[PDB]
Design a protein around this nucleic acid. Sequence first.
RNA 1: UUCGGAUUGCAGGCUGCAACUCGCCUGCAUGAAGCCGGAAUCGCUAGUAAUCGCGGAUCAGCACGCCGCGGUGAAUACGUUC
RNA 2: GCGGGGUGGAGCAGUCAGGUAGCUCGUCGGGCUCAUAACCCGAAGGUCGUAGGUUCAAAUCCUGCCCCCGCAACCA
RNA 3: GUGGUGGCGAUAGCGAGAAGGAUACACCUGUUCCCAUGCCGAACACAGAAGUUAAGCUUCUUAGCGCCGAUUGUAGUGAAGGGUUUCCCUUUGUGAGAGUAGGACGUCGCCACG
RNA 4: GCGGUCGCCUCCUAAAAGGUAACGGAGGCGCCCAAAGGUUCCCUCAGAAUGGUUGGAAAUCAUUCGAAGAGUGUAAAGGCAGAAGGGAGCUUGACUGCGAGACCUACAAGUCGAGCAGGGACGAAAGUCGGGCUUAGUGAUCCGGUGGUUCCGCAUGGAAGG
RNA 5: UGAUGGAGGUAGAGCACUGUUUGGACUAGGGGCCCAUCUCGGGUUACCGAAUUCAGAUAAACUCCGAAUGCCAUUCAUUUA
Lengths: 48, 177, 118, 74, 299, 134, 80
Amino acid sequence: MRVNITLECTSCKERNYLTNKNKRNNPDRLEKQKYCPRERKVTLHRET
Amino acid sequence: NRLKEKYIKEVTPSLVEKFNYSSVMQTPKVDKIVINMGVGDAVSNAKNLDKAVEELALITGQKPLITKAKKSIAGFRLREGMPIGAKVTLRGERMYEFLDKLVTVSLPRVRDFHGVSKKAFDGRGNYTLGIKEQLIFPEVDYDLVDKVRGMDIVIVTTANTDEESRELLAQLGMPFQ
Amino acid sequence: MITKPDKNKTRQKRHRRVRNKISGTAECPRLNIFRSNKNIYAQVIDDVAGVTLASASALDKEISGGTKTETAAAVGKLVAERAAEKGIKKVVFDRGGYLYHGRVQALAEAARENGLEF
Amino acid sequence: SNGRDSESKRLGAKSADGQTVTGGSILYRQRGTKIYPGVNVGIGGDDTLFAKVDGVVRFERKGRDKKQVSVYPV
Amino acid sequence: SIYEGDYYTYKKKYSENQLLREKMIIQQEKEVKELATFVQKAKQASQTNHALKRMGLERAIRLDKKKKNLTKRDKVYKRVKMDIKPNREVARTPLKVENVTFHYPGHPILYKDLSFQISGKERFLVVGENGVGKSTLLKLLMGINIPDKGKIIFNDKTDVAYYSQELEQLDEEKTILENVKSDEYTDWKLRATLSNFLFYDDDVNKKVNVLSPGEKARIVLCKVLLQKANLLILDQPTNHLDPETQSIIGANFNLFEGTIIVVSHNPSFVEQIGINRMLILPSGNIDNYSPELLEYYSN
Amino acid sequence: LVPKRVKHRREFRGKMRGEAKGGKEVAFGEWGLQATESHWITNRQIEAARIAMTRYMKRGGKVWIKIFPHKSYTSKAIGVRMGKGKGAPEGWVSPVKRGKIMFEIAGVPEEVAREALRLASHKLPVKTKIVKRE
Amino acid sequence: MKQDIHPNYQPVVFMDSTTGFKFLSGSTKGSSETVEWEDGNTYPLLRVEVTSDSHPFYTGRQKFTQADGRVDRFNKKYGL
RNA sequence: UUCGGAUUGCAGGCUGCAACUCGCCUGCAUGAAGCCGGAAUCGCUAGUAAUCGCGGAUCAGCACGCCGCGGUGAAUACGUUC
RNA sequence: GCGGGGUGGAGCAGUCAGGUAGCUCGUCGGGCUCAUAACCCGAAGGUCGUAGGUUCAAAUCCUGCCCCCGCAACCA
RNA sequence: GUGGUGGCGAUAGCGAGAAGGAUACACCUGUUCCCAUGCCGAACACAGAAGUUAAGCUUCUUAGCGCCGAUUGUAGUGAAGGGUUUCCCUUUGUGAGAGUAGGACGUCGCCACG
RNA sequence: GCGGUCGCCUCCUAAAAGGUAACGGAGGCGCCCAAAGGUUCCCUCAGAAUGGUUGGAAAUCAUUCGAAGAGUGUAAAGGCAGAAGGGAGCUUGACUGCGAGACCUACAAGUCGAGCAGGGACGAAAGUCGGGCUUAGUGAUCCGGUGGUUCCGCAUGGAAGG
RNA sequence: UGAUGGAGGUAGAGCACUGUUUGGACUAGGGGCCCAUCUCGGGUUACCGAAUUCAGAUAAACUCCGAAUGCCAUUCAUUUA
Ligand SMILES: [K+]
Ligand SMILES: [K+]
Ligand SMILES: [K+]
Ligand SMILES: [K+]
Ligand SMILES: [K+]
Ligand SMILES: [K+]
Ligand SMILES: [K+]
Ligand SMILES: [K+]
Ligand SMILES: [K+]
Ligand SMILES: [K+]
Ligand SMILES: [Mg+2]
Ligand SMILES: [Mg+2]
Ligand SMILES: [Mg+2]
Ligand SMILES: [Mg+2]
Ligand SMILES: [Mg+2]
Ligand SMILES: [Mg+2]
Ligand SMILES: [Mg+2]
Ligand SMILES: [Mg+2]
Ligand SMILES: [Mg+2]
Ligand SMILES: [Mg+2]
Ligand SMILES: [Mg+2]
Ligand SMILES: [Mg+2]
Ligand SMILES: [Zn+2]
């Protein structure tokens, strides 16, 4: 089951990115180091 | 190293003379020994492959590489990439030691051993011995074996012709039939 | 019967792919490295003109020698200074299809230290 | 049951050989690299050949059996 | 869902609701089949029968609207299936315990010169109360505890399977499949049995650390089942199990064709197994099983 | 004659214009039947001509059928209006263009060959003539 | 050669028990008994009852009697 | 299994003109099924059953069968419903 | 062209909702009977129509194909 | 001459045969070193210079294959017309593929050691 | 009328730019992938012959031949063996604000895009990276949900609601 | 309209790929016949024959090739608007 997901910056809680993932292949919340435009630096974003 | 010593001392001059080699570089030599262990039973239970790998490692002294099925085959209940079959590659000193042990100890212990075949050649000068059963190698321990299995040992040499390979292998010691 | 592939041929197969994205200009020449079992050779080339601006190697007789790695360092220093004399500072380093690990890496570091910017 | 077909994608050459084009002009629309990007020419994500800089478009033959596009500024 | 009353009232109310729901789905299916049956009759009629063809399309529209409002029957939760069989056969003397004394260093002796002998295909109950040595005795047989005195002999024909009381046989760090991995079982064989224990598909890749106590209990039981031993040392097996799984466990053990050394404070579970001999603690008493178990409990 | 397999169930009728691309000379047999006009030839016509030729030859000698009916053609039943897709395949044909050597024969005297080829021609729908090997 | 993945390997001497013919070769098995060897070096020793020299095939002379034919058996039994 | 003694190889003994079709017996060699037996079924109320040997008639040779003999030696019979 | 079906000798389950091939009758053999029937006890008989895919795993899901059945193949 | 390194459509290739290592390149010896093989110092990496042109590589011969390929003719066809018009023909311009004559066992540069 | 069809992608029709109809001839899509993305390094296939325990046409192994006859998640076409195919290491560029100029086009849309800035991944460096060999995998507005917001706030401060 | 340069795979042609396909040669191999059956080894049909090879065809959805035209463009040329 592949679903659209939102990656939110952990630092400022800003829903910066939209992506998608297969729940079965990745049961746990995804986490990626992405650039947060609000904070203007690379931060850890975790699916919401 | 004994087999290597025997090669360089006796075999190399003998082959040079027999085949009138202009330069010593022409001398055929054993390049590598590839021992292959085909285990289709891994499909039924991977523990058969595990024990085969363990026995092979004990025999060879090197951890074997576990080959995988390049193509799925339904006839054998085989799936592509399944870890069926293992092999070990021996070169240099380990190659010579294993061949020497095979000639001296392993081969005689074969039941009613009348020698090895003399037609099992690729046609280029490389030989392959199909061992029917283990327990001929002293490291197998004759009891741990829950399932008896064989193997296929491939002697690859720089001989262009099967005749040179046979003579070289004979001089190194090979009980042909 | 078994054929051992020519190591130089395999090197060149890799080297073509490297050259697909590394090329030498008059103002940014190509630093090409050739590694032999005995020696190592470096050239500074302008592919556009197809002329070697500078050259050095273990046979210059100005390299006192030693371990092949140390000879590579001497070659790097010598080629860098010769290129500087001819007015070259920047270059693009072609590893000749080799692995940027040993003698070639030593030569590259020597060139960097002795003045070639890359 | 037949009767389906996609919209034509208007592929082909969009600039003539010897024509002067502004930088970034699309020169050739293609599926795959039917023609390769040459001097001052880039290839887009969908294989489209465009001019990097202003110049004259030239379709040469890349070797024995391949074509190529270059843009030569004047 | 929250009901007012007791467990039976919940069962009564629940059973009725699923019954009344089931009847609703039956009638919705009949109407759909009826329309479907008419739609097919029109579909295969001659193209020259215009009116029937017309009515067929009109009913095709109703059929579509029906199939889109047709309640799905909830899949009834599947119950555990256990088939425990011994690889080998029991002997007349599976286990010999003779003059066994044991004490935990610094504590009173639990039993002195304990001697019993099991018969084979016997239901042996180790009765007692809390903190009396029941689990210690079972640990003694397996080898966890070395007897202070005496001997414990297992016949060479006896294979033993141990179910510990506190679920100490699972690696919390590993997954369900990794825990059950055995040299004697292939992958699909493991999955099939785990499916018999209600672990479906990627439920077997879950870490044991996140499972509930009840789900962990099934994994331990599965390990016991996969041994195919002829002697079962079970220490409170029904603990942590839902009432439905308990009855399944007891019924299957009753049919087990092997020796069972069991401990259980659950009166229902022991009744299903049909105990033969009970060993009372701390007062060592090898006795024939009967409702006299209550007499020992009273005393 | 019918192909064992076909890439496509249905195919364009096509167009016949000019001389045949190849096979305009007798290759195997001593004599051959050359088409002087272009026309479709059905497997039925090929078979009829072949049977006539063999029967007159008394099975003495060899016969080659140079042409083969690769192409398929469809049709629509009576009472079917235009439209609603192409018709179901009906028969097989070989588009034969003038100059094609449809049949060859060998191992027989000239007069027997000429008479056998004459019978075959009358079975075929195209005007033909006899051509001798070179 | 990678470390900590291969089974243990050590040089070991071999003697033919039937003859005593001696040779040095590596092995995975370990022999409690150890013997010395020219160059004054000691290694574990694996006594071998059947080796190349021992086995009849390598020597060229076969121990077995090849049995007796029935004709000769009959002649012997009945003195004919 | 030191139970088992089938099957099989070799080598012997005998009787007889003759042991292959096709005898018994012995030595070495091997060690089969078989772990107390489904539906049902047989004998027996005492020196009986059960169990153990011995003789003999036929008979050149050939019995686990038959006739007979002796050794040890029970359990049970409530009762006539089936 | 529209549907329905291919599982032991026959008739059916099991499918939906993937983990395990059963049920009834019948057949073979043995019992019981004077004999037959009925009855009692054993045993056999299918890799799920076939060929490919999904899956750790297919009678089960997907694709095609071959068979069997019913219907239709033209209306003023 | 040899080694690097390039440009030009293989006319630069392939096959076959022959000669050479002065240097150079090579095989070649080893695994202590950085470094490595889903096993193997075979590879890659590193150290070294005993032996050999055997192979690779360079040079040379070879038209067997591959490659290039004129001219002529023809098919097709633009244009203008004609005919008995599912097709065919004329004038005019263009003109292949195929088959061939032949060409070709490369050439034009730069660097270093000779 | 019945049957079929309705949007999108690929091929032929399509007449060597592009475009081009038919209830013309063939197939696909309503996804998938946390790597099957990025980068650095490395590697080359399918089959055939010969030899070889289980093992058989065919499992695994070796030598040789083999230029693509394989593979490229998914239809077809185009393209790719200087890989776009295959393996490993590290990573998240499957980035943010844009965007000269182009293609396509009635509009709405659709497509490509150097380059600039911010801050990064890989690599020694050059440099590559704004998803995947390319081309389908999608739906206007209205209305509503959720998060953020230095915006507004019906006398003013809030709020309500935007 | 001429000149020049280009993009593209149609007509034609071709078989280098993929389909369809004919005859010859040879045969892996499959067939039934008998001997030998432990169905084992022959000996057979000008028995049937894969693949290979030779020769010969064929194609909208084949291409080693490939026009005439048309098309795009040129600070070009002539005429024109
Ligand atoms: K005619
Ligand atoms: K007898
Ligand atoms: K009995
Ligand atoms: K007698
Ligand atoms: K080396
Ligand atoms: K050489
Ligand atoms: K040539
Ligand atoms: K990667
Ligand atoms: K062809
Ligand atoms: K065409
Ligand atoms: Mg299209
Ligand atoms: Mg893209
Ligand atoms: Mg306890
Ligand atoms: Mg017993
Ligand atoms: Mg009486
Ligand atoms: Mg008596
Ligand atoms: Mg030509
Ligand atoms: Mg056109
Ligand atoms: Mg077009
Ligand atoms: Mg890819
Ligand atoms: Mg206000
Ligand atoms: Mg044509
Ligand atoms: Zn943030």
